[PDB]
Design a protein around this ligand. Structure first.
Ligand code: MH2
Ligand code: MH2
Lengths: 205, 205
C-alpha cells in the first residue's frame, strides 16, 4: 500500500516562511487523503498497487479505462506531495552545476525566477508550478490539479523530469497568505531545497 | 464597470452553518479580486464593459482572442459569486413548483440531493456544482474553476440556466472544514436559499 511519508523535518522547520499549522494540516489531512483514495482505487489492481507512485504516474495509459481519472488525480496527488516535502528545506543555496545550467537555459537566475513566478501566478484554479528537465534543457511549466509532467504532454499539458515544484492549491497558502498567491510564491524562494534539486538534476542530466 | 455587490445579509447570517470569517474574506478579498481583474480587462473594451456580467459570460465567443481567458476566469468569478450570495439563506423550505419539478426530473428530492452531493464532491480541483434548467428539464452539472453553465458546452463542458449552485473552491470551506469538503456540502443544505431558487425557476420555467 502507499503510506503517508514521514517528513524530512518538523512541521515548524520552514518558519518563518511557510507556516507550521499549514504544514501539519497539509501533510496529515490533504496528503493522507490522496494516499487513502489511491490505495482504494488500486486494491483491485495487484499489477499496479505495489509499484512506486512515481512509476505508476508514467503508465496511466496502461490502466483499465475506469481507473485512469481516479489514479491520475490521487496517484498524482501522492507523487506530487511526496516530491514537495523532499523539495523544501531551509539552509540551501542555488549554486554549482544546477545554477550554471539555470543561467545557460534562462540567461540568468533572475530570469528563471521571474519565469517561475509568472507561471506559478498564472495557474488559474488549482495546480503546480515546476522546474523540469526536458531533453537536457531546463524549463518552467505548470500543471492543473494533481497532474504531473511525468504523466506526459497528452495528459498533463507538460512534460519533462521534475527538478522541483511549488504547490499552488489554495490549501498550501490560505492560512498565512489568504488570496495573496504572489506573496506565497516569493516566500517559496526561502524554502526551496536547492540540494535536492541539484541531486535530481545530477541524476537525470 | 463591475462592482462588488452588497449582500442580502450580514456576514454572520449563515451561522452556525457557514462561518462568518470565511463569508467576509470570501466577499471582500476573493470576490473583490475577480471584480478588479475583470474590470482591468474590460478597460479597453467599452462595447463589452456595460454588459451585465451574467450576459457577458454568455458572449465570450465575441471577445478578442487575447481577452477570452482573462474574462472567462474573472467575469465567470464575478457572475458565480454574485449568484452564490443571493443563493444562500437560512430557514427556507423547498416547496411548490420547484419541488415538483425536482421530483419529476430526479424521481425524488433525496435522489436529487444525492446526485448534487456526488457532483459537488467529485469536482476535482477548483470549481462549482450547479442545479441547471435546460429548456424543459432540470439537471445537475459541475464546472471547473470559474466556468459557468451560462458559458455553454463548448467553453465550460456544461450548459443550462443556473437555478442555484455551490462553490467548491477550497477558499469557501478551508477555515472551518479544512479538507472535509463532504462536511461543507452537508452544511450547504441548511443554507441553500430555496426561495431564490424558486424565484429563478419561476422566471425561467
Ligand atoms: O496540492 Mn497540496
Ligand atoms: O470560487 Mn469562491
Amino acid at each position: 500500500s502507499y503510506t503517508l511519508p514521514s517528513l524530512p523535518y518538523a512541521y515548524d522547520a520552514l518558519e518563518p516562511h511557510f507556516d507550521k499549522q499549514t504544514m501539519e494540516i497539509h501533510h496529515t489531512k490533504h496528503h493522507q487523503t490522496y494516499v487513502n483514495n489511491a490505495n482504494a482505487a488500486l486494491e483491485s489492481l495487484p499489477e499496479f498497487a505495489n509499484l512506486p507512485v512515481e512509476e505508476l504516474i508514467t503508465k496511466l495509459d496502461q490502466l483499465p479505462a475506469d481507473k485512469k481519472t481516479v489514479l491520475r488525480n490521487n496517484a498524482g496527488g501522492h507523487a506530487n506531495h511526496s516530491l514537495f516535502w523532499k523539495g523544501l528545506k531551509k539552509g540551501t543555496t542555488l549554486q554549482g552545476d544546477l545554477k550554471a545550467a539555470i543561467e545557460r537555459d534562462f540567461g540568468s537566475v533572475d530570469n528563471f525566477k521571474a519565469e517561475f513566478e509568472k507561471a506559478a501566478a498564472s495557474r488559474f484554479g488549482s495546480g503546480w508550478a515546476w522546474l523540469v528537465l526536458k531533453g537536457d534543457k531546463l524549463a518552467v511549466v505548470s500543471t492543473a490539479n494533481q497532474d504531473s509532467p511525468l504523466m506526459g504532454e497528452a495528459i498533463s499539458g507538460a512534460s519533462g523530469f521534475p527538478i522541483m515544484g511549488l504547490d499552488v492549491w489554495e490549501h498550501a497558502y490560505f492560512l498565512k497568505f489568504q488570496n495573496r498567491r504572489p506573496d506565497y510564491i516569493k516566500e517559496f524562494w526561502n524554502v526551496v531545497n536547492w540540494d535536492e534539486a541539484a541531486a535530481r538534476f545530477a541524476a537525470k542530466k
